[PDB]
Amino acid sequence: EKPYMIGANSNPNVINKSTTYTTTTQADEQDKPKYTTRLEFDTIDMIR
Amino acid sequence: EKPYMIGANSNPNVINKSTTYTTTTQADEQDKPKYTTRLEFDTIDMIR
Amino acid sequence: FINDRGIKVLWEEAYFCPCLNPDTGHPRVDCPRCHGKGIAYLPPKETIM
Amino acid sequence: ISLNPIQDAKPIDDIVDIMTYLKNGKVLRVKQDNQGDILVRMSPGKHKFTEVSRDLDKESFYYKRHWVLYNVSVNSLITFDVYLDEEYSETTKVKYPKDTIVEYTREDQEKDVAMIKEILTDNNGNYFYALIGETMLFDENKLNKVKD
Amino acid sequence: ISLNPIQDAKPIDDIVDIMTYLKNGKVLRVKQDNQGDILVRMSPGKHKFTEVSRDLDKESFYYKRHWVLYNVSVNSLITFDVYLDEEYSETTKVKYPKDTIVEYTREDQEKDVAMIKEILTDNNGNYFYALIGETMLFDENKLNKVKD
Amino acid sequence: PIQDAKPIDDIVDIMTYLKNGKVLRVKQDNQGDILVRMSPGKHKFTEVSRDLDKESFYYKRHWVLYNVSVNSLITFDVYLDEEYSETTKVKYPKDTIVEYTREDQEKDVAMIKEILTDNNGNYFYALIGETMLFDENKLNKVKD
Amino acid sequence: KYENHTVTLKILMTLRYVVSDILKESRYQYTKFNQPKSKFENLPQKLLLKREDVIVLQDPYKVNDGIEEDLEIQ
Amino acid sequence: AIQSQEKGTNQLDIGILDTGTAIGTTQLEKRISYRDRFTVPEVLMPQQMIYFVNKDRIKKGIPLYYDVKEITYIATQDGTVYEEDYEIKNNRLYLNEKYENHTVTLKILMTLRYVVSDILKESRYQYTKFNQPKSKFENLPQKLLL
Ligand SMILES: [Zn+2]
């Protein structure tokens, strides 16, 4: 009903942000994949 | 007679497909060829 | 890229076996953990390399 | 003139209940410290196995969640805090959740420490906090969290 | 309301019969584990030798099969299951062939094991299976094959 | 009859026994039998041991960590280790494929599910999809 | 039958390697783009391996999974 | 900046020994000295070690060769060990009486450290003059062999 307007900002300031270090752990995980094209030789042509 | 329509899919799902390993065997085989162009030197020109 | 080019492989870490003789600093000839080698190994882990 | 209290997502602490939900087929949501936040489900039908997905949203008619087999580990469940999908949501990402201990400024210009016991938000989205030892509710800007 | 039974291609097990067909000139079809599926023929005319082709289809008027000399090996025939071209065809690529042992669900909610003894298909292409110890016919979706 | 095997059906029970800390025994196909355990102390994690024989003055079990998968537990047979009997001395074990002649003298294939015995050691077998018993001689092992 | 005889064989064995030295061990990057904050990540190491011939140990006992391979689902 | 971080290991009569080598590139205006020292807290290096316990070491506490950031795996003849039985203070290890006569083996992570063995391509120079009140001299990065 009412018009959509951007409004004001909301993000507060942050100072002295520390970097993130990956934690060591013996537990299992899942490696997040990327699905895309794949490169391969033409082994049939190599035989020729 | 009746119109040709694509219809629904038929391929069932498959999970945990294992790769194929070539089997060792002392028996003979036939190597499937590729018929195409061939590259060669010009040995007559090399003599020159 | 690593997963694309690599080959599937089993990976096991290494650690000195307890069977090492404290005085000579050298191992027993045959124990389950290490079969004469002075180094034991952990359970396998799967990896692409 | 405010919205009713909004509940925090309870992490499931005991393995037995988690497996019990999983056997029933209720979806779990696991956060991995290293890689990502994932859903976990035991496969429907008789062909039983564990499945994992990264389609982190409610199953909308236009958002079909996709599953793939994975050998989930027991230790992964134990070490990583896990939630039930029906609770963990964007509906509340409160800065200081329930049971959090905070330092709050009192009327006598003394900073006392208290725990958040109830949470509700006004229509404008500001979170009202109920604190132990105090009657009224407190605002986020007034508060301070002391870490470690 | 169904199509008559469809026969499976019988692999030829004994070398003697295979050579006998080959001497008569009847075409063979060999599957190589490593490389490919090929046809084998002994040359027509008096100039006798073995020939190999990869033109895997019926000799249509617009599909001329082409032959080349090859020194076929006896061991290749023995180890690799071989068929007669007149049987091996796309006409049947049934998932569970005849003489296959399968696990099938019975009316009493018990999974019994039985062998397929007869095969026929309805007009819609669904394969009906006759099983030892059972009278009626069974459907592919109902069945399960246990391997090893 | 003989009660050499007491398989667990529900994984929930397995987890409950694991919480109790009792050792498990998990079968494998064409592979060595394994024992599984929950670690004690502050940190709880699954441990495994390739040592099957009973703890003794000359024999101590060796335990190590592992990221065990529920898929193995839910599928493979599981037992309480101390309650397990090493073998049941019969010609054809359970879940073994045999060829038998039905009541009308027609031959069918079947797998075995029964354990019955007299006090002399004479054994009888009841086939999956069947009711009556079959003797050691009547059944014939089906080759792979 | 072969009480006093010399037997000769040709055999196939699985490939195995051990780590003799680590080359170009640690490589680093402060990944920051499209992140809430800076993160540290370890890039691939390079390994110099040697084959196991003087001492040989059997392949490791891997815990198997009951999932059937090449399984069809519906 | 650091390149070609290498863990060269020599197997000797005296034992195994690590002689790693690496190449560093520095900032401007910094003068480095022979046998200076650098340490990288962020990077961790794995090591393995074994020690034998006796009636005296158990009370004094084991003196560790390497340093420590955290422990990964502990084991002895009796198997693994748990946090309730071992503690570490000031880079030395204490154990309870249960392991009076035993051999303890460990896998450990330690922070990375380098020292300067030689200075390569020491000093590089430039008379920067553009957009300056006057000419200025600046020292370009040195390269270090660690
Ligand atoms: Zn040893």
Side-chain angles (χ1 to χ4, degrees), chain C residues 17 19 31 33-34:
Chain C
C17 192
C19 80
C31 76
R33 299 310 313 158
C34 61

Side-chain angles (χ1 to χ4, degrees), chain A:
Chain A
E1 183 173 349
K2 299 301 297 180
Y4 301 93
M5 298 300 186
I6 299 299
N9 197 297
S10 191
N11 278 77
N13 288 292
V14 190
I15 193 78
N16 196 27
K17 289 186 295 192
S18 287
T19 185
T20 299
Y21 309 111
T22 185
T23 182
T24 185
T25 175
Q26 302 92 330
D28 199 356
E29 79 198 328
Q30 193 260 12
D31 204 18
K32 66 187 174 185
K34 276 193 75 181
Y35 301 104
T36 186
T37 184
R38 164 164 171 83
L39 305 198
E40 307 182 342
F41 291 114
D42 191 347
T43 54
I44 297 96
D45 206 58
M46 281 174 58
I47 295 161
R48 174 207 58 73

Side-chain angles (χ1 to χ4, degrees), chain H residues 123-140:
Chain H
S123 173
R124 290 181 281 205
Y125 45 85
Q126 167 157 290
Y127 284 149
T128 185
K129 304 196 290 185
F130 175 85
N131 194 3
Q132 299 286 267
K134 64 191 78 177
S135 304
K136 188 188 174 206
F137 186 83
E138 303 194 323
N139 292 88
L140 307 181

Side-chain angles (χ1 to χ4, degrees), chain G residues 5-67:
Chain G
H5 280 81
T6 45
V7 72
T8 177
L9 297 96
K10 272 166 64 60
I11 174 165
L12 295 192
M13 55 175 278
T14 50
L15 179 59
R16 289 189 293 283
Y17 281 116
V18 291
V19 181
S20 191
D21 276 337
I22 304 183
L23 192 61
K24 295 198 179 191
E25 176 161 24
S26 173
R27 290 181 281 205
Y28 45 85
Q29 167 157 290
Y30 284 149
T31 185
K32 304 196 290 185
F33 175 85
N34 194 3
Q35 299 286 267
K37 64 191 78 177
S38 304
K39 188 188 174 206
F40 186 83
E41 303 194 323
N42 292 88
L43 307 181
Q45 320 198 277
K46 185 197 286 188
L47 310 178
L48 194 150
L49 312 178
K50 285 188 187 179
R51 280 173 37 67
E52 271 197 337
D53 192 28
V54 64
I55 308 174
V56 168
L57 295 171
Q58 289 297 318
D59 292 329
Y61 179 101
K62 195 195 185 198
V63 187
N64 195 23
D65 294 329
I67 304 303

Side-chain angles (χ1 to χ4, degrees), chain E residues 70-108:
Chain E
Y70 176 75
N71 305 308
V72 172
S73 183
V74 173
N75 308 327
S76 194
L77 303 168
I78 294 165
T79 58
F80 305 152
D81 288 346
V82 59
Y83 300 94
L84 275 164
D85 178 26
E86 302 186 314
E87 285 285 2
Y88 193 107
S89 50
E90 176 163 29
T91 304
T92 178
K93 282 187 193 186
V94 64
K95 192 165 183 67
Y96 306 149
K98 186 184 172 188
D99 314 318
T100 307
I101 291 167
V102 294
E103 185 187 59
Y104 69 112
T105 51
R106 297 195 78 264
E107 303 187 352
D108 62 351

Side-chain angles (χ1 to χ4, degrees), chain H residues 14-137:
Chain H
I14 59 168
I16 58 152
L17 195 66
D18 185 3
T19 183
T21 307
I23 293 156
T25 297
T26 57
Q27 281 171 323
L28 282 70
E29 304 176 351
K30 307 299 174 80
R31 287 178 287 243
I32 310 307
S33 179
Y34 173 52
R35 293 184 289 201
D36 281 343
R37 185 168 194 253
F38 296 105
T39 180
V40 181
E42 290 78 346
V43 164
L44 299 172
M45 295 275 292
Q47 312 289 9
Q48 49 267 33
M49 57 188 175
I50 184 171
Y51 293 143
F52 170 56
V53 187
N54 53 39
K55 192 175 177 72
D56 281 13
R57 280 176 148 179
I58 196 77
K59 292 190 283 279
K60 293 179 179 182
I62 302 287
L64 304 185
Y65 300 157
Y66 307 98
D67 65 314
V68 192
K69 183 75 206 299
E70 68 187 313
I71 307 297
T72 293
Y73 178 89
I74 307 176
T76 176
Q77 287 87 342
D78 294 304
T80 185
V81 184
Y82 309 106
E83 294 190 341
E84 312 302 337
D85 295 7
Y86 81 94
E87 190 169 11
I88 294 166
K89 316 178 183 176
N90 198 12
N91 210 68
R92 62 167 42 240
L93 165 67
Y94 305 113
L95 291 174
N96 54 15
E97 309 171 343
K98 303 168 64 175
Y99 314 129
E100 183 179 1
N101 212 333
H102 280 81
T103 45
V104 72
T105 177
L106 297 96
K107 272 166 64 60
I108 174 165
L109 295 192
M110 55 175 278
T111 50
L112 179 59
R113 289 189 293 283
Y114 281 116
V115 291
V116 181
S117 191
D118 276 337
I119 304 183
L120 192 61
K121 295 198 179 191
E122 176 161 24
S123 173
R124 290 181 281 205
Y125 45 85
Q126 167 157 290
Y127 284 149
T128 185
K129 304 196 290 185
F130 175 85
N131 194 3
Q132 299 286 267
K134 64 191 78 177
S135 304
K136 188 188 174 206
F137 186 83

Side-chain angles (χ1 to χ4, degrees), chain E residues 134-147:
Chain E
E134 295 295 340
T135 54
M136 69 191 190
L137 304 177
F138 297 78
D139 306 278
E140 63 280 342
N141 290 353
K142 297 171 180 166
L143 295 180
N144 171 37
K145 178 180 177 185
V146 174
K147 315 177 194 87

